[PDB]
């Protein structure tokens, strides 16, 4: 169940309300200000890292379950999403539907959106690719 959720469900959830549109209408006060803007933030693919922990001083390193248990840390990985920031603008001629056009500003980077706890012995855990000897090295019980 966890493997299905991490592999497929996470992408599906972010592809439901990915688009956020903020429309700044004409605001007719003078004819030098008659343009209407439209800002759009859209979410693309989601990426997941291996389990990791960030210390107080800001250093991030891979976290293994044995250290997490001893140090009262949460065994979790990071989630990243590709975000596209588009802006269209159109001339708001009075009493007409607008023709929004891309105004040559389409920024397109990975954004951290939180940490996902990882179930042990799962596809995203460090112990799924470990042999019996590897588990013994990592102080894990086969």
């Amino acid at each position: 169940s966890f493997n299905q959720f991490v592999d497929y469900t996470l992408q599906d959830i972010i592809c439901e309300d990915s688009t956020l549109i903020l429309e700044q209408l004409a605001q007719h006060t003078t004819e030098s200000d008659n343009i209407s803007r439209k800002y759009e933030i859209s979410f693309g693919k989601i990426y997941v890292t291996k389990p990791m922990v960030n210390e107080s001083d800001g250093v991030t390193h891979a976290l293994y379950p044995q250290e997490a248990r001893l140090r009262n840390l949460t065994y979790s990985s990071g989630l990243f999403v590709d975000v596209k920031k588009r802006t269209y603008e159109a001339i708001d001629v009075p009493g007409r539907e607008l023709k929004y056009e891309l105004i040559a500003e389409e920024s397109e980077g990975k954004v951290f959106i939180g940490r996902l706890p990882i179930m042990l012995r799962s596809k995203n855990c460090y112990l799924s690719e470990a042999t019996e000897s590897d588990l013994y090295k990592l102080k894990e019980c086969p």
Partner: peptide, 9 residues
């Protein structure tokens, strides 16, 4: 005058 900011779905 409008709210000068609204969300389209």
């Amino acid at each position: 005058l409008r709210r000068k900011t609204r969300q389209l779905k």
